[PDB]
Curated annotation (Swiss-Prot), chains A, C:
Species assigned in the record: Mycobacterium leprae (strain TN)
GO molecular function: single-stranded DNA binding
Name of this chain's protein: Single-stranded DNA-binding protein
Keywords, comma-separated and alphabetical: DNA-binding
Domain SSB: 1-105
BP GO annotations: DNA replication
Curated annotation (Swiss-Prot), chains B, D:
One Gene Ontology CC term in the entry: nucleoid
Name of the protein this chain belongs to: Single-stranded DNA-binding protein
Domain SSB positions: 1-99
Subunit structure: Homotetramer.
Annotated organism of origin: Mycobacterium leprae (strain TN)
Keywords: DNA-binding
Lineage of the species this protein comes from: Bacteria, Bacillati, Actinomycetota, Actinomycetes, Mycobacteriales
Keyword match Transmembrane: no
Gene Ontology terms describing biological process: DNA replication
GO molecular function, one term: single-stranded DNA binding
Amino acid sequence: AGDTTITIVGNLTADPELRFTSSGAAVVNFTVASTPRIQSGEWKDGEALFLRCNIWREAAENVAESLTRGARVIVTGRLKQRSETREGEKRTVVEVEVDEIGPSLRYATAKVNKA
Amino acid sequence: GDTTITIVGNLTADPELRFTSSGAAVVNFTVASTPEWKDGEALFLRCNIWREAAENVAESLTRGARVIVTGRLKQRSFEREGEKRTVVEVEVDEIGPSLRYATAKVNKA
Amino acid sequence: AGDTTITIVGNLTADPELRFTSSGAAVVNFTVASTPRIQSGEWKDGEALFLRCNIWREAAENVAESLTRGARVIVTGRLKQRSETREGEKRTVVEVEVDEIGPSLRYATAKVNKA
Amino acid sequence: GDTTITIVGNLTADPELRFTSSGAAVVNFTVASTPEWKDGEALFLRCNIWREAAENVAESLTRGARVIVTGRLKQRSFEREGEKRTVVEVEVDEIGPSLRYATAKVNKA
């Protein structure tokens, strides 16, 4: 495909927002806040990066069932650009189409249940 | 200037879990990543993780668990001509079970 | 640092724009257009991703000396969010702070001259 | 589902350049990546690239050139107990000389 991929580690800013399309397909959107650590090297919170993420179907439902606001997650996916409404100003935004997502075990444990 | 990597695959075994001299937790595991499209060629990366993270892994994961792993790729060579031997391994920065085919109960320990 | 890194392959949409700050530091900005290939698998141009990139100092000058509009490049760097002026609407944008950049040798040759 | 990687480092030697039975260009090279911070631990990744790209590499690059390489990580093991031997290598998707410490004259061949 030649897609631009990314791995992002961070915290969900809110509970995953679950919605179903007309066809019945689940769609979930959420924002990952990634805070780098940056006389100050790795011992001061840097400016956060906020990336909106989209995930679909069974993986979306898995996420809606498992994750909540503030959860630390590891996300891999592909960078996508999405484009107004009632203002005229036609703006583009970069988002992540999620390939895999999981809760990080850095500060937490998890009980996994396979589909 | 580390070479970083993300790998998605399955734990080949239940994670090890040991404690060092200093009383520090260490966990070793191997991720088998196999790229419908039949079955592609597998990649088995040896991984290690330390401390609380290592304890969380050992309490949470089991053989076969699908995981997302990110970290730094390291390499060693064992030699003067004796047939060079080289190995790589991943010093894990973050690891979690993928929710692609599963759900999980998450508890901030 | 815990930064979110990326590798992007694509073409410069224009000649690199070279500028110097008050201190005399070179700053170069450019946009990478990355076009994935996506009955149609890998044999149809997908929607392009356009990422604005920032690079500084000697590396910026190296780029201003070497690259032009349309050049195929490989870029690694870190994703950064940058925030109005005279409209009120306060908007964020995602950009790349470049760590390494080079012309791709996929369709081109290069004569490299070390600093 | 390939495991991809990006590595930045220096060519350990002038790139090889050969032609296969079919008349297809192949190039093999090794990237040495060494992570002021003294000198960190080196990573040497064996790489291969094919066809026009391979010809471009061979005409453009020389030993020591700083390169940015992206591609797919592959692995093989040579065994029944004979002492397992494992190697990895990168099937290169894209490669270019870094402009971090250099300029370059670029010609669309």
